[PDB]
Amino acid sequence: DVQLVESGGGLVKPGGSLRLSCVASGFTFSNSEMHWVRQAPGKGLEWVSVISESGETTHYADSVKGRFTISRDNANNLLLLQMNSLRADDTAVYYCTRYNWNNRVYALDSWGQGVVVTVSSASTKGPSVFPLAPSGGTAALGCLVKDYFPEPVTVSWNSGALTSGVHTFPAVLQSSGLYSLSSVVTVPSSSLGTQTYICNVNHKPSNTKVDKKVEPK
Amino acid sequence: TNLCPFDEVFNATRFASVYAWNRKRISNCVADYSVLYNFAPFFAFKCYGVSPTKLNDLCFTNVYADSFVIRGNEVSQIAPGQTGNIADYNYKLPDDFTGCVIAWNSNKLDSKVGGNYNYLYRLFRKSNLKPFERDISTEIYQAGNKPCNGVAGFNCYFPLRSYGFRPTYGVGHQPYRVVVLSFELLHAPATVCGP
Amino acid sequence: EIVLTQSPATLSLSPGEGASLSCRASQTVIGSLAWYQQKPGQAPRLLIYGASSRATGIPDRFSGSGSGTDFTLTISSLEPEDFAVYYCQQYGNWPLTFGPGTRLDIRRTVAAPSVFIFPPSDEQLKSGTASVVCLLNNFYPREAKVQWKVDNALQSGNSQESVTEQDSKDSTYSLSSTLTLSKADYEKHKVYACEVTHQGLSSPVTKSFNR
Ligand SMILES: *[C@@H]1O[C@H](CO)[C@@H](O)[C@H](O)[C@H]1NC(C)=O
C-alpha cells in the first residue's frame, strides 16, 4: 500500500537547523506533487510548502519563506525539507503528504505519520515525581511529574495492573520551558490501608524510569 | 507623471500567449523599480548582469517589458542558455542577457473550471528561435516526407497546443505570469533613469 | 489568502444522530474544497474532495456539498468512531489554507465534577517550590471554571490547566489545575482554596485546606 515515513526531526535550539526527510513507497513518487504541512501542539493544520512532481516548481508559506527549502530526489523516492534559522514558532508535528491530482483526487489523500520538531533552548531533563496523597467513600490520589524536557512521558499505575479510574492528563508547558504533568486515580477509601499504589513514570529522552509509592500523609 | 507605465504591464487583466508574447517599449520616463518590489508572490526575481538595487541608480537607452503566461515548470526556461519547449520554440533569451526575469503564480487569474484554452504554446518548429524572436505562424508542421498543403493529419500536426489551465492542476502545471525586463544601452543617449 | 471559518467550533451529538458541519470561505474557492478527519495522536484522513466527491474507502454516511464560499459536510448517522476533529481545506489559491477545525464530542447527561485538592508534598517543598493541585473528576459538559483563592484573594497568572479527552466508557471529562509558587510565597499564606463552577452544580463548590 501507499506509505510515507518522515524522519530527521527532534530537539534543536533556536537559530539551529534540521533536515526533514520523507520516504515514499507504494506509488509513483516521481509523478506525485508533494506538500509539507505542520501542526503545532494543541493547534490546527498549517500548510508549509509544496513541490511539483519534477521539482521545478515550489511554493512556500510566508512565515517560512527564506528559511525553509523543499526539495526531492525522485530516483530515491525522497522528499526533503531543509529548515534553517528555526524559531520557537516552528515547533510542530510535520507531515509529508501527496496531492493526488494525477489520479483525479484533488486533495491531500496520502499522509505520513508525522515527525516531531521541537525548537527550544531548554535542555533534556528527567522528571521529578512527587506524590499527591489521599485524605467520602471514594478517595483520590496521584503523582505529579514536574520539570521534564522534552516530551513525552508515559505513566502507568502498579505496572499497568491498575487502569480503572486512572486519568493521565496532557502535559502543560511551564513558563520555565519545562513540562509538567499529573496522573490521578480514584479508589475505594477502605483500600487506602491495605492496597499499595505505585505510579511508574518513563521518560525515554532522558533514559529515566521512576517508581513512586503514594501513601496517605 | 513622468513615471514609466510598469503598472500597465504587471497589473494587466489579460496576458499574451507565450508564442505571441507581448512587448512594451519604454523610454523617456523616470523608472521607479520600487513599485516592482511590492508583490510578495514572486516565484522568480532573477536578475542577470545588474544588481536590483543599482537599477534605481542607472540610466539606459531603452527598456523592454516582454509579458506572457507559461506553466510553472517552464519558468526555469526563461533564463540565458536554457533549453526546452519554451526556450527553443516560444521565447528565447540571449546568452549575454542583461535584465531581470520576474514570474509569479497566476492560478487565480488565468485558470478556469473546464479549462482556459486561450493560452497557447508552440509545440513543433523546424528550428530553434533566435533571441527575442516572436513566431506567430500557424502553418502545419511537416514532420513527414509528404507535403501537408495546409491539411492537418498524419505526419502533419498543428504547431500550436493549448495549456488548458484548470484551478485544480498541480502547481507545476498551473499558470504563471512572466515579465522580462531587458535594459538596452546601445549607440545612443540614455533615456530611462531611476530616481 | 482564503480564510476558512468553521461552524460551530464544537458539536455535541449522540450516536445515531446526523451531523452538519459548515465551512465558509472569505472569497470564492476556485479549486477544490476538501474535508479531513483527525483523531488524537493520528495523522489527518481525507474524507471529501471537490466539495462533494467521497475518497476511496470512506463510508457513504459521509457526504459533502456546496460551492463558492459555502460548504457543508454531512454525516447521516454518527458511529462511535466518527467523534473526532474535522477540517476543511482549499486547493487552487496560494497559500493552501485550512479551517480551524470542528470538534465532535458525544452528548450525555450532565454530570457534576468531583473536586479534590492536593497540597504540595514535603518532598517538593524541600526542593523550594510548591504546587497545589485541583482535580475535577468525571464531569460533563467539558466547560468548567476553576478559580484559585489564596487567603481569599483570587489568583490569576500563576495556574495552568489540562483536560483529558472524552472518556470512552462514560463520555465524561476530567480537569487538572496546578497553582505553582515559591516556597517562600507558599509559607506567606494560610488558606488555599479551589472554587469550581459547572453546569451540574447549583452553586460553586469550594475545596480548601490550611497550610
Ligand atoms: C490591478 O490593480 C488593482 C489595484 O486596486 C487590483 O485590485 C487588481 O487585482 C489588479 N489587477 C490585476 C489583473 O492584477
The maximal CA–CA distance of chain B, rounded, in angstroms, is: 60
CA B170 to chain CA centroid, Å, is: 21
C162 and A182 in contact by Cβ < 8 A?
Answer: yes
CATH class given for the domain over A3-119: mainly beta
H helices present in B115-186, as ranges: none
By CB neighbour count within 10 A (0-12 exposed, 13-18 middle, 19+ buried), where does B96 fall? exposed
CA B135 to chain CA centroid, Å, is: 13
Q: Render A33-98 in DSSP notation, one character per residue.
A: EEEEEEE-TTS-EEEEEEE-SSSS-EEE-TTTTTTEEEEEEGGGTEEEEEE-S--GGG-EEEEEEE
**Residues of chain C neighbouring A108 (CB-CB closer than 8 A):** 34, 36, 44, 46, 89
Give the resolution value in Å.
Answer: 2.3
Topology of domain A128-214 in CATH is Immunoglobulin-like (2.60.40)
* Secondary structure letter of residue B17 according to DSSP: B
- Centre of ligand 1 to C-alpha B176, Å, is 16
The reply to whether domains C4-106 and C114-210 share a CATH topology is yes
Which amino acid belongs to residue C16? Answer: G
Per-domain boundaries in chain C:
4-106, 114-210
Which amino acid belongs to residue A88? Answer: A
- CA B22 to chain A, closest CA, distance in angstroms equals 24
Q: How far apart are CA B138 and CA B122, in angstroms?
A: 9
C-alpha Rg value of chain C to the nearest Å:
22
Q: How far apart are CA B66 and CA B21, in angstroms?
A: 7
What are the structural domains, with CATH classification, of chain B? 6-187 (3.30.70.1840)
Q: How far apart are CA A48 and CA C33, in angstroms?
A: 18
Q: Chain B neighbours among C 49-108 (CB < 8 Å)?
A: 50, 91-94
Topology of domain C114-210 in CATH is Immunoglobulin-like (2.60.40)
Residue with cell 486519568: A167
- Is the distance from CB of B20 to CB of B121 less than 8 angstroms? no
Which homologous superfamily is C4-106 in? Immunoglobulins (2.60.40.10)
The reply to whether domains A3-119 and A128-214 share a CATH topology is yes
> Sheet harboring C129-139: ordered strands across?
C114-118, C129-139, C173-182, C159-163
B43 touches chain A (CB under 8 A): yes
- Is the distance from CB of A55 to CB of A78 less than 8 angstroms? no
- Is the distance from CB of C161 to CB of A172 less than 8 angstroms? yes
Query: Which residue of A5, A62, A104, A132 to mutate against C (max C Cβ within 10 Å)?
Result: A132
Residue B61 Cα distances to B51, B52, B99, B124, angstroms: 18, 18, 13, 36
For residue A101, the tally of other CB atoms under 10 A from its CB is: 23
**CA torsion through residues C185, C187, C189, C192, sign:** positive
For residue C83, the tally of other CB atoms under 10 A from its CB is: 20
A52 and B76 in contact by Cβ < 8 A?
Answer: no
Per-domain boundaries in chain A:
3-119, 128-214
Residue B67 Cα distances to B16, B56, B119, C64, angstroms: 7, 21, 13, 40
Return the partners of chain C (3 or more C-beta pairs < 8 Å): A, B
Q: How far apart are CA A84 and CA A14, in angstroms?
A: 10
Among residues C80, C44, C28, C35, the alpha carbon closest in space to that of C62 is found at C35
**Does B127 sit in the ligand 1 pocket, CB within 6 Å?**
no
C178 and A59 in contact by Cβ < 8 A?
Answer: no
The maximal CA–CA distance of chain C, rounded, in angstroms, is: 64
C-alpha cell at B165: 489551465
Dihedral of the alpha carbons of B166, B172, B178, B180, in degrees to the nearest 10: -160
C95 touches chain A (CB under 8 A): yes
Best probe residue, ligand 1, of B8, B11, B36, B109 (max atoms within 8 Å of C-beta): B11
C94 and A59 in contact by Cβ < 8 A?
Answer: yes
Q: How far apart are CA A92 and CA A83, in angstroms?
A: 13
Q: How far apart are CA B183 and CA B154, in angstroms?
A: 44
**Residues of chain B neighbouring A31 (CB-CB closer than 8 A):** none
- Is the distance from CB of A83 to CB of A34 less than 8 angstroms? no
- CA A123 to chain B, closest CA, distance in angstroms equals 38
Q: Residue A28: which residues within 8 A CB-CB, separation 6 or more?
A: none
C-alpha Rg value of chain B to the nearest Å:
18
Residue C151 Cα distances to B85, C147, C155, angstroms: 79, 13, 10
Which amino acid belongs to residue B56? Answer: N
Technique behind this structure?
Answer: X-ray
